């Protein structure tokens, strides 16, 4: 399940249909965030 913080955040920005510009690869991003990223 998603924590409430995430939920609110997903709602506060433009509708997902206004995002179809360049985008990012979910699978790369997740593996990137898990292993390669350390949130300050």
């Amino acid at each position: 399940e998603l924590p409430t913080e995430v939920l609110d955040l997903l709602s506060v920005i433009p509708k997902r249909q206004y995002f179809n510009t360049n985008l990012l690869d979910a699978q790369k991003l997740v593996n990137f965030l898990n292993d390669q990223v350390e949130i300050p």
Partner: protein, 91 residues
């Protein structure tokens, strides 16, 4: 979308933006970046744990819902965690 109805059935659709005067991307930045630095960091660390515990779930959600994909990116950008040039490897 059985994946969502099972795991993520309450996904927000986003706000309605009047893209005849304001661009989504600019709103996206002002939206996350008007928030106190603690938020972005709180979200991303919390999220980081969540996505490490659930790589399949997390990644597949980012696969289908792009607001989170870029919401994460923009928060990475605003804190300086990652730069645009670090996001293109993801792209």
């Amino acid at each position: 979308a059985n994946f969502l109805s099972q795991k993520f059935p309450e996904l927000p659709s986003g706000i309605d933006v009047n893209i005849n005067m304001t661009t989504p991307a600019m709103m996206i930045s002002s939206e996350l970046a008007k928030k106190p630095k603690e938020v972005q960091l709180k979200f991303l660390q919390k999220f980081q744990e969540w996505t490490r515990a659930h790589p399949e779930d997390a990644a597949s959600l980012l696969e289908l819902c792009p607001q989170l994909s870029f919401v994460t990116a923009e928060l990475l950008l605003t804190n300086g965690i990652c730069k645009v040039d670090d996001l293109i490897p993801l792209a």
